[PDB]
């Protein structure tokens, strides 16, 4: 297991424009196109992202290319963020994957609400952190995925991903 395999499980792979769990147009392996309800705006974002007229459909290789860009940018964003970097760098590599997963899903603005959890994670109070992480809109809206990510934060193992 690694961050790619982990996110592939949590996000799936779809080659045609679909709506994510929040109702937002998306493609590939959780590549958000736009929060706009305009399908045409979504198709334009897709064409911009791929560099060709896709008419709402991409290939597996194209999906994987966006995925690599998205994972990389998520990590680089964490490192640029003064509130996230110290906590991230305090973690072991497996727990860092849980961090990347969380930011990939909810963005840095979503993780902004997790200040208290992040503190407990930095303190390595793993059971307390796990309890605090579940007291969230995140957990209530996507509980089965959040349970896996939280188990990863709690244990520093990949037990939840097989
Ligand atoms: C971005 C991030 C960093 C550390 C812990 C959790 C998390 O979501």
Curated annotation (Swiss-Prot):
Induction: Expressed late in the viral replication. It is an enzyme of class 3 (hydrolase). One of its GO terms (biological process) is defense response to bacterium. Optimum pH is 7.3. Substrate binds at residues 32, 104, 117, 132. The active site is at 11 (proton donor/acceptor), 20 (proton donor/acceptor). Changing residue 117 to V: 50-fold decrease in enzymatic activity. Endolysin with lysozyme activity that degrades host peptidoglycans and participates with the holin and spanin proteins in the sequential events which lead to the programmed host cell lysis releasing the mature viral particles. Once the holin has permeabilized the host cell membrane, the endolysin can reach the periplasm and break down the peptidoglycan layer. This is Endolysin. It comes from Enterobacteria phage T4. The gene is E.
């Amino acid at each position: 297991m690694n961050i790619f395999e982990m996110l592939r499980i949590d996000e799936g792979l779809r080659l045609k424009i679909y709506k994510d769990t929040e109702g937002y147009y998306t493609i590939g392996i959780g590549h958000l196109l736009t929060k706009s309800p305009d399908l045409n705006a979504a198709k334009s974002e897709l064409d911009k992202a791929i560099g060709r007229n896709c008419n709402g459909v991409i290939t597996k290789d194209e999906a994987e290319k966006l995925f690599n860009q998205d994972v990389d940018a998520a990590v680089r964003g964490i490192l640029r963020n003064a509130k996230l970097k110290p906590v991230y760098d305090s973690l072991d590599a497996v727990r860092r994957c849980a961090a990347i997963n969380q930011v990939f899903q909810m963005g840095e603005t979503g993780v902004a609400g997790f200040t208290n959890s992040l503190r407990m994670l930095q303190q390595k109070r793993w059971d307390e952190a796990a309890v605090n992480l579940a007291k969230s809109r995140w957990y209530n809206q996507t509980p089965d995925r959040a349970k896996r990510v939280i188990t990863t934060f709690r244990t520093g193992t990949w037990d939840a991903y097989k």
